[PDB]
Write a protein that binds this ligand. Structure first.
Ligand SMILES: Nc1ncnc2c1ncn2[C@@H]1O[C@H](COP(=O)(O)OP(=O)(O)OP(=O)(O)O)[C@@H](O)[C@H]1O
Ligand SMILES: Nc1ncnc2c1ncn2[C@@H]1O[C@H](COP(=O)(O)OP(=O)(O)O)[C@@H](O)[C@H]1O
Ligand SMILES: Nc1ncnc2c1ncn2[C@@H]1O[C@H](COP(=O)(O)OP(=O)(O)O)[C@@H](O)[C@H]1O
Ligand SMILES: Nc1ncnc2c1ncn2[C@@H]1O[C@H](COP(=O)(O)OP(=O)(O)O)[C@@H](O)[C@H]1O
Ligand SMILES: Nc1ncnc2c1ncn2[C@@H]1O[C@H](COP(=O)(O)OP(=O)(O)O)[C@@H](O)[C@H]1O
Ligand SMILES: [Mg+2]
Ligand SMILES: [Mg+2]
Lengths: 235, 392, 116, 116, 243, 399, 348
């Protein structure tokens, strides 16, 4: 019987679970399976009667991320993008060149760029170059929207952005992609960009997943985002 | 399908003036009722294998479920009232041709195989939602609204009576009609009058009644209501206060709002479900017409829109004549000064004015309402514009 | 059915409609005679002193609701209690009226003199 | 004591609303939340007394109609009955004489003498 | 294999020395006893507890359930940043070190001196001035529980949720003493309460009112020191700004 | 003047005083009438339901007893992730309706091949092992999926959308009728079009007209259906309908009211399944999809991306010639005079949708019925357009 | 045999038992109970159960395997809102609150004296105040006086904050108000303290959205619970606010808030009393002009005086000397009451 592990508690670890029969139970011992990873939310196959965790199952869909189509094969070879030679050279040298020469980066004792940024008039190929980079790097693509996030009530901060980043890191040849500028009463966007800065700044050491943060204009710029780390590589 | 089970509709006594003729008619009705009770009781008194074995096979108790699919002639997908659904068998004695997705199959308590079907399942809510005693109000009790009554009779009565004109002209009968106007204009009274004069099943619904706490109970209730209406054809469904659920459609976040939207989308779907040629019509009333969804009132769903304006001077005097038709007024009461006063008097306001005038008459130890009593009553019942002097 | 509210004007017209609500009774703040009646009702259990003129106390409460009259009685009783007595004098009622009906006025005379 | 101990060991009976008596042996009743069952009536209860929408009792798990219970009124609303009358009389109301008469002309007069 | 797991619920009342009213989560409530060897004196009302599935007796106690946003906000690694990585803040870092850590290291010094330890302080300044860094370093030095929350991220569309989140934050802080709640951008929740205002304006006032009562309110705070960072100290509410 | 409460003497006098001599008898008779009616309704009662017992010629009672004893009942569940069975992990997540979710093995009867994600699995009641897949067997003649082969409406019936009908003709005919032209022009045939315009403009009718002209069967799918009770296996719905379309000859897929679907877990399953049936299915097929909703933006952004729905046809409110053509089309099916000025009626209803026009014609018919006339006159149409359209100011300052 | 049978009847009342609501009595020995398991059962009432405690919706204990109405519980044992336990009681005494003699007296006359000397009120023949409003500038002693009242009370103290009432789910705020007042009623003479009452009790207006309507519903439920149809007995309610003028007039009337006690900023003598009562636990001040510090005209609340003393202690710790003198006390005074303006000169 499948259950959703609510949390793990220390006693030497105990976990409380919510079985799929809308019942919340406590476990002094964690079943017949290991108890180290045991993510707080990992679905577990618990006993039908004694309710002990026999074994753990693969993860589940988190709604919007399933709705957030991967389109894993973008089918580009840089022959689709034309006229942006300097731009794609910059993109390569900003994302994949540090990806393969991260050793030369830690020799310098500095961290690789954790995210590229571009800006320009609409329809100039910003998304096409993103898809091209995803193809040449065989990295998972996520087409996060910019105007869509401003709506959807208060909550499109650390509930979707974090959702977008989080489970991308296991099928992780990955390149998550911000799109048309967004607004980079007026308090929801403030929360959105606070989530952005304090989640992108909380990035991965090897940076196995990168962010590309295409926009539509250079008029509206947040220094907390356009700084180093978050969005410094600008094309 | 079984025909329309209309209301009781005891015959109307015409005099109503507390005279001998009223006594004669009422005594005649009482006489017929007595000879009816005598016959029913005496015929109750006079004159007195496989069925028992099939009852044994059914077992005890037998649960009631709703059929949803039929894979083969010996297997189906029934759903218990809880919400769970099972792949169950159909035993031989169950009459197959009655099995139709949406019926009420009788299920064995253990191994819920279909052992019978229930023609009448109607739950207590949809059962009380059906009119049994016709309201005493009648078109004679409605003052004014000649155009409104004419439109409602063209909409829910003319197709019911001789309808040959509708297909002679080639136009479809108006599927559903909605009444709107300021509160107290006659929207509910005009539905009472329809129920009193109808020859079809009348289903009164509060609108807010359809919403139910448990998940899936709202759409199920709406589906059962309209299934009863169709199965009870011809029938009329009066969903009063449609704005209780008819408000503007907006994106839902909470589960309850999702269930409300589900209930209304079910109601809209089932309104689309039956053909206009069908003898089931819907009647809806509201005060806030502007707050309704601009999809329930689509021309393809509810073509007619009967307006109920505040009564004019002649309609006001007609309503006053109707509501003072049972009073012992004097010869001094003009009743014209009141309908003169440019106010927003409605049918409800006029009825309350009459009641208050009666109470003033009682306050004077007299049973003959005078003009002074009406004068004080009008001011007493009228509650609550432009400053005096601006507009001459 | 009986209903009560302090804001009738915000009530819906479909609910205020006659036939659903007839005889919308208004409860205005008591006048001087009614205030005196309320004072005599709420001072029935007190130990008043000979020479008490509740009419003057009622005249001292212009536009005071019945609840404020009961509060005046209660505060006069408390003024008696503080001095550890059981009887209540006219002065006690006067200070009770002053305390209960105390309200913040327009401190700025300039604002108050906007209107003639 | 021994009889009470004996009847305290039998399981409680579910309550339910009989929507209609289908037959002189079967009764279809909705029980919350098990669902709707067509139960039988035991030897005691006469079915002609089983009226639609009346609260009943069904046995342990055989679901046999064995008692007719008073009509269903949910506790959240049955609490609104004023079982303990409050101690406030018209003699303790100052002013509001006209208001009292007006409220009596709608609350008392109709119920007392509807003939008028 | 031998274990059977346990029902978990919250104690509601202590009927007597043995009979406890316990409500299971998303289920019914019972009157239950407790295990023979157990500290009954701590089983307060509202304490999450575990029930044996069969006999339905108080099996063992549980720490109060932590809110998921509170969980994610409390389980973020500060990064054990030392004090050397601040620079040019000597006077201010010394002051904040005093006000926060001195009550957390030698409370007897404050007890002797004659004062109650101060309950928290404010760091205001232009963005990028390292107030977040300074608080993060304080937390690492103290090696205590640290709730790093950002105001304007606890606000919610639902009417009563932001104040509830503040309540849960401070309840965790009290449960996990010693603790330092760093609320950044307090300028968001804290804002001179004013009348008029849209529903949102009022909702934020209600939240500020909770924060205020949750800091200096009937229930005194202990070993829970707060650090609040903002760029617009001038717009903060006087009641919040009050000592 | 203080009101005086009615004394008991006043109550007694007022009751009797002036009254009909018959009034007592009338009141008693009426009360007895009500009591008698209640008594009749009490003594009729007990109407026999007579449950669905077939005639005894069909009862094999022994066989029903044996099937009651033997045939186990299986609860119906919705399957989920296969959890990489591959004969090493033959387990699946199954959601047993409102009861719960479980992870269950197969049965000896079933095989792994016919069990995948998303179809209706009949699980047992002890071990909950999947014992028989139950495909929804939808083929829904009881609901939507119009499945109309040759709609009665034709090219003449649609009026006013001449530019619209021409764009539709191009996209869904020139590849369909002249594939060789697109092949020798080196371009994939138009994968589909999104017919967007204000509701009631007639886009559905224009699509059905071209369907009748193409002689390709017209499939209309509603969205509210699979938002309401028939949710979940909607992926299998579209799977089977696309499959039978492949079995069918040249077709015309049409999604109306698809805004409900586009605007999401089972819903998301529905559109990724149609992605599998549009991108995965070769774009050269004759099952051309005709997308149509008022909303031009609510459609999911991954849907109109190139290699998919390729163009958009913008329907607009009919013009004067369009309005008079619609009026003539709708009045052809009516008993009216031969000298009706339909141009006049088209003029009198500017910015009026086609549905408004059909409602105007219906109201004209009702107005003719009102005067009990078998033929509707121009005055009836004028009054109908006065009633429907507009739901001194324009006559006293304008002239 | 009677002893054995009585033992068996006592044993059936053992634990565990499922809680249920006594819906309605049918017979002398049977009843209808709605078990908390979500079902309604027709069960048998134990004879030993006292009957007049068996009121509708009263929480009763049912036998686990038979649902028999085994025993009845205290009327509001399963209350969602918790009271103030003995350990939760604050340690602030009336002595620690310097000054505000009139404020203390006016609170006590409504929250303390009626509970201990009700015979005085009965002799005078007046209703003791049931409800006091505690308003004034921030940090002038309101919540401290509430804490002190909770310390020096034999009542069942219920502490709530105004914002706590506002719930996410619709109709849960008024429900919480109803439950807290019902808990106070069913308990002994009780005190309800609602800090920051103006979070929910702002002046009613024409609400145009669901949230505002719900907040006004909470306020209306508070009003109808305080002075509604069914009056409360021995239930005193204390509410503190910073802005009394924004409170609804229906809340600010006698019978609901009989006394609106103002807590002004300390003046002269009050400042001296506050300084003395806060510096009592302080070390000796080596003869600093505390009376002159008091004499300085400054609009500072008691919280500011506590801050001045706290700052003095911090400075003394920082410079490592346990005995405060005028230097660090003066620096603390300047720091606390800074009142920095910098305002452009054209304004004044
Ligand atoms: N035209 C009329 N002639 C006579 N009486 C009328 C008329 N219109 C209204 N009334 C009186 O008004 C009373 C209330 O009217 P009704 O119930 O029809 O209102 P409604 O318009 O449906 O109101 P609401 O939408 O506010 O519920 C009726 O009982 C009837 O006595
Ligand atoms: N240099 C280019 N070469 C080829 N195609 C381009 C180029 N620039 C833009 N496009 C076309 O424009 C579209 C991408 O627009 P883009 O600017 O990426 O979207 P947005 O502005 O919405 O982010 C693609 O269809 C792509 O074929
Ligand atoms: N003394 C300092 N003042 C300001 N910034 C500093 C200091 N030392 C380091 N930093 C840099 O500033 C960043 C701190 O950001 P943060 O604390 O969020 O600033 P703020 O508190 O203004 O939001 C660190 O990433 C660090 O690289
Ligand atoms: N151009 C047109 N010619 C003839 N009838 C039309 C036209 N446009 C709309 N209609 C009428 O509209 C009605 C249905 O409209 P529909 O096609 O459902 O609107 P939508 O554009 O929303 O699909 C039909 O009765 C049809 O006769
Ligand atoms: N009269 C007083 N005597 C001593 N200390 C006081 C006095 N008034 C206020 N204080 C100090 O101020 C604080 C009171 O704050 P509080 O009463 O909660 O403010 P509010 O008025 O906002 O409730 C106490 O911690 C106390 O140290
Ligand atoms: Mg009505
Ligand atoms: Mg306070």
């Amino acid at each position: 019987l499948v259950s959703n592990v609510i949390e793990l508690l220390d006693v030497g670890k105990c976990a409380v679970i919510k079985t799929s029969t809308r019942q919340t139970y406590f476990l002094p011992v964690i079943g017949l399976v290991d108890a180290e990873k045991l993510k707080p939310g990992d679905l577990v196959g618990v006993n039908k009667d004694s309710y002990l965790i026999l074994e753990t199952l693969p993860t589940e869909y988190d709604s919007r991320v399933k709705a957030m189509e991967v389109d894993e094969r973008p089918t580009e070879q840089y022959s689709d993008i034309g006229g942006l030679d300097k731009q794609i050279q910059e993109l390569v040298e900003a994302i994949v060149l540090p990806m393969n020469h991260k050793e030369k980066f830690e020799n310098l004792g500095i961290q690789p760029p954790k995210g590229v940024l571009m800006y320009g008039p609409p329809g100039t190929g910003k998304t096409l170059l993103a898809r091209a980079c995803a193809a040449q790097t065989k990295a998972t693509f996520l087409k996060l929207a910019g105007p869509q996030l401003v709506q959807m009530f208060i909550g499109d901060g650390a509930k979707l952005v974090r959702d977008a980043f989080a489970l991308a890191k296991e099928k992780a040849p990955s390149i998550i992609f911000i799109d048309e500028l967004d607004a980079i009463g007026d308090r929801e966007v403030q929360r959105t960009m606070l989530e952005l800065l304090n989640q992108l700044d909380g990035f991965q050491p090897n940076t196995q997943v990168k962010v590309i943060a295409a926009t539509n204009r250079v008029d509206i710029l947040d220094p907390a985002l356009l700084r180093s780390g978050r969005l410094d590589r600008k094309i | 399908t079984k025909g329309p089970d209309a209301a009781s509709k005891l015959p109307l006594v015409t005099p109503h003036t507390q005279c001998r003729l009223k006594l004669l008619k009422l005594e005649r009705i009482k006489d017929y009722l007595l000879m009816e009770e005598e016959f029913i009781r005496n015929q109750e008194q006079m004159k007195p294998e496989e069925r028992s074995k099939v009852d044994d096979l059914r077992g005890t108790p037998m649960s009631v479920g709703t059929l949803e699919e039929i894979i083969d002639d010996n297997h189906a997908i029934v759903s218990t009232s809880v919400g769970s659904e099972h792949y169950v068998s159909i035993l031989s004695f169950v009459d197959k041709d009655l099995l139709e997705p949406g019926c009420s199959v009788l299920l064995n308590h253990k191994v819920h195989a279909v052992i019978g079907v229930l023609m009448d399942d109607t739950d207590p809510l949809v059962t009380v939602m059906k009119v049994e005693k016709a309201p005493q109000e009648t078109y004679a009790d409605i003052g004014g609204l000649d155009n409104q009554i004419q439109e409602i009779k063209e909409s829910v009565e003319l197709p019911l009576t001789h309808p040959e004109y509708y297909e002679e002209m080639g136009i479809k009968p108006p599927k559903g009609v909605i009444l709107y106007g300021p509160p107290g204009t006659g929207k509910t009274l005009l539905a009472k009058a329809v129920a009193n004069q109808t020859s079809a099943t009348f289903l009164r619904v509060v609108g807010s009644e359809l919403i139910q706490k448990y998940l899936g109970d709202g759409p199920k209730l709406v589906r059962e209501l309209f299934r009863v209406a169709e199965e009870h054809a011809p029938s009329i469904v009066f969903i009063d206060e449609i704005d209780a659920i008819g408000t503007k459609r907006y994106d839902s976040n909470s589960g309850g709002e999702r269930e409300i939207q589900r209930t209304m989308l079910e109601l809209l779907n089932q309104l689309d479900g039956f053909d206009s040629r069908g003898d089931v019509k819907v009647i809806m009333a509201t005060n806030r017409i502007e707050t309704l969804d601009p999809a329930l009132i689509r021309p393809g769903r509810i073509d007619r829109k009967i307006e109920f304006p505040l009564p004019d001077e002649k309609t006001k005097k007609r309503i006053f004549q109707i509501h003072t038709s049972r009073m012992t007024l004097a010869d001094d009461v003009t009743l014209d000064d009141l309908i003169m006063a440019k106010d927003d008097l409605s049918g409800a306001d006029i009825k309350a004015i009459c009641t208050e005038a009666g109470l003033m008459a009682l306050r004077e130890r007299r049973m003959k309402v005078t003009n002074e009593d009406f004068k004080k009553s009008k001011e007493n019942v009228l509650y609550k514009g432009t400053p005096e002097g601006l507009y001459l | 059915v009986i209903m009560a509210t302090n804001r009738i004007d915000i009530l819906d017209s479909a609910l205020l409609r006659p036939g659903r609500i007839d005889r919308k009774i208004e409860f205005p703040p008591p006048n001087e005679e009614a205030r005196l009646d309320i004072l005599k009702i709420h001072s029935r259990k007190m130990n008043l002193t000979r020479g008490i003129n509740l009419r003057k106390i009622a005249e001292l409460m212009p536009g005071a609701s019945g609840a404020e009259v009961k509060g005046v009685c209660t505060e006069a009783g408390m003024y008696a209690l503080r001095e550890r007595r059981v009887h209540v004098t006219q002065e006690d009622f006067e200070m009770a009226v002053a305390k209960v009906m105390q309200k913040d006025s327009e401190k700025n005379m300039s604002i108050k003199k906007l209107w003639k | 004591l021994r009889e009470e101990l004996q009847l305290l060991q039998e399981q409680g009976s579910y309550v339910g609303e009989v929507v209609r008596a289908m037959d002189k042996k079967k009764v279809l009743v909705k029980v919350h939340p098990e669902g709707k069952f067509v139960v039988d009536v035991d030897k005691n209860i006469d079915i002609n007394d089983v009226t639609p929408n009346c609260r009943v009792a069904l046995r342990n798990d055989s679901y046999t109609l064995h008692k007719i219970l008073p009509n269903k009124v949910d506790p959240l609303v049955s609490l609104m009955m004023v079982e303990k009358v409050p101690d406030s009389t018209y003699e303790m109301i100052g002013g509001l004489d006209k208001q009292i008469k007006e409220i009596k002309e709608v609350i008392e007069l109709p119920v007392k003498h509807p003939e008028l | 294999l031998q274990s059977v797991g346990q029902i978990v619920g919250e104690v509601l009342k202590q009927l007597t020395e043995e009979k406890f009213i316990v409500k299971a989560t998303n289920g019914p409530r019972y009157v239950v006893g407790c295990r023979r060897q157990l500290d009954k004196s701590k089983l307060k009302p509202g304490t999450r507890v575990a029930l044996d599935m069969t006999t339905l007796t108080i099996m063992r106690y549980l720490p109060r359930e932590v809110d998921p946003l509170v969980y994610n906000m409390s389980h973020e690694d500060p990064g054990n940043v030392s004090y050397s990585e601040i620079g040019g803040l000597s006077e201010q870092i010394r002051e904040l070190r005093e006000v926060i850590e001195l009550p957390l290291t030698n409370p007897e010094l404050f007890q002797r001196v004659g004062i109650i330890p101060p309950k928290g302080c404010l760091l205001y300044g232009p963005p990028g001035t390292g107030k977040t860094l300074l608080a993060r370093a304080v937390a690492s030095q103290l090696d205590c529980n640290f709730l790093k929350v950002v105001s304007s991220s606890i606000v919610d569309k639902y009417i009563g949720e932001s104040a509830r989140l503040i309540r849960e934050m401070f309840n965790y802080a009290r449960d996990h003493q010693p603790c330092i709640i760093f609320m950044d951008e307090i300028d968001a929740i804290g804002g001179r309460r004013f009348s008029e205002g849209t529903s949102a304006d009022r909702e934020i006032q209600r939240t500020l009112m909770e924060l205020l009562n949750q800091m200096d309110g009937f229930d005194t705070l202990h070993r829970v020191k707060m650090i609040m960072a903002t760029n617009r100290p001038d717009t903060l509410d006087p009641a919040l700004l009050r000592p | 003047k203080p009101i005086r409460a009615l004394d008991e003497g006043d109550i007694a006098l007022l009751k009797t005083y002036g009254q009909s001599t018959y009034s007592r008898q009338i009141k008693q008779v009426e009360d007895d009438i009500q009591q008698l009616l209640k008594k009749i309704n009490e003594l009729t009662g007990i109407k026999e339901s007579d449950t669905g017992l077939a005639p005894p010629a069909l009862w094999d009672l022994a066989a029903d007893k044996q099937t009651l004893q033997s045939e186990q009942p299986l609860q119906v569940a919705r399957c989920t992730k296969i959890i990489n069975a591959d004969s090493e992990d033959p387990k699946y997540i199954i959601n047993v309706k409102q009861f719960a979710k479980f992870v269950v093995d197969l049965s000896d009867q079933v095989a792994p091949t016919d069990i995948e994600e998303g179809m209706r699995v009949g699980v047992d009641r002890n071990k909950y092992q999947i014992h028989i897949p139950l495909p929804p067997k939808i083929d829904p003649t009881v609901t939507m999926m119009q499945v109309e082969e040759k709609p009665d409406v034709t090219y003449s019936d649609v009026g006013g959308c001449k530019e619209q009908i021409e764009k539709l003709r191009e996209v869904v005919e020139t590849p369909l009728l002249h594939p060789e032209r697109f092949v020798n022009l080196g371009i994939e045939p138009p994968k589909g079009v999104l017919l967007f315009g204000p509701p009631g403009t007639g886009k559905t009718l224009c699509a059905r007209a071209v369907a009748n002209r193409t002689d390709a069967c017209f499939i209309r799918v509603i969205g509210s259906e699979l938002v309401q009770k028939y949710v979940g296996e909607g992926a299998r719905m579209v799977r089977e309908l696309f499959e039978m379309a492949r079995t069918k000859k040249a077709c015309l897929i049409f999604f109306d009211e698809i805004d409900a679907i586009g605007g999401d877990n089972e819903v998301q399953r529905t559109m990724l399944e149609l992605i599998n049936q549009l991108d995965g299915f070769d774009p050269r097929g004759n099952i051309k999809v005709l997308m149509a909703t008022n909303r031009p933006d609510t459609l999911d952004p991954a849907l109109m991306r190139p290699g998919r729905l390729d163009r958009k046809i913008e329907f607009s409110l009919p013009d004067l010639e369009g309005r008079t053509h619609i009026f003539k089309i709708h009045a052809r099916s009516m008993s009216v005079e031969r000298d009706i000025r339909f141009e006049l009626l088209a003029r009198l209803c500017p910015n009026s949708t086609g549905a408004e026009i059909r409602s105007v014609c219906t109201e004209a018919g009702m107005f003719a019925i009102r005067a009990r006339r078998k033929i509707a006159t121009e005055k009836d149409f004028l009054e109908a357009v006065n009633k429907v359209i507009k739901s001194t100011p324009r006559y006293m300052t304008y002239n | 045999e009677f002893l054995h049978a009585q033992e068996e009847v006592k044993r059936i009342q053992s634990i565990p038992l499922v809680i249920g609501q006594f819906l309605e009595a049918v017979d002398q020995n049977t009843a209808i109970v709605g078990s908390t398991t979500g079902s309604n059962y027709y069960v048998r009432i134990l004879s030993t159960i006292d009957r007049e405690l068996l009121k509708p919706n009263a929480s009763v204990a049912l036998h686990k395997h038979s649902n028999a109405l085994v025993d009845v519980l205290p009327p509001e044992a399963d209350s969602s809102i918790m009271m103030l336990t003995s350990d939760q009681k604050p340690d602030v005494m009336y002595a620690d609150i310097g000054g505000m003699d009139i404020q203390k007296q006016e609170v006590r006359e409504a929250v303390e004296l009626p509970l201990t000397h009700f015979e005085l009120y009965k002799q005078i023949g007046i209703d003791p105040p049931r409800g006091v409003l505690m308003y004034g500038p921030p940090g002038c002693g309101k919540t401290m006086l509430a804490k002190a009242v909770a310390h020096h009370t034999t009542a069942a103290f219920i502490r709530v904050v105004g914002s706590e009432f506002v719930q996410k789910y619709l109709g849960e705020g008024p429900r919480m108000v109803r439950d807290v007042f019902r808990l106070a009623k069913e308990n002994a003479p009780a005190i309800i303290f609602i800090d920051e009452i103006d979070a929910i009790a702002t002046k009613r207006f024409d609400a145009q959205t669901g949230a505002d309507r719900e907040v006004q519903r909470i306020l209306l439920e508070l009003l109808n619970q305080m002075d509604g149809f069914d009056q409360n007995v021995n239930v005193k309610v204390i509410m503190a606010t910073n802005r009394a003028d924004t409170l609804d007039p229906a809340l600010l009337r006698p019978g609901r808030l009989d006394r609106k006690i103002e807590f002004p900023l300390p003046d002269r003598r009050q400042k001296r009393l506050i300084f003395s009562t806060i510096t009592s636990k302080m070390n000796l001040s080596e003869e600093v002009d505390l009376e002159d510090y008091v004499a300085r005209p400054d609009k500072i609340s008691g919280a500011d005086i506590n801050s001045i003393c706290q700052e003095s202690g911090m400075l003394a710790v920082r410079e490592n000397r346990y005995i405060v003198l005028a230097k660090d006390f003066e620096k603390a005074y300047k720091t606390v009451i800074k009142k920095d303006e910098q305002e452009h000169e054209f304004y004044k």
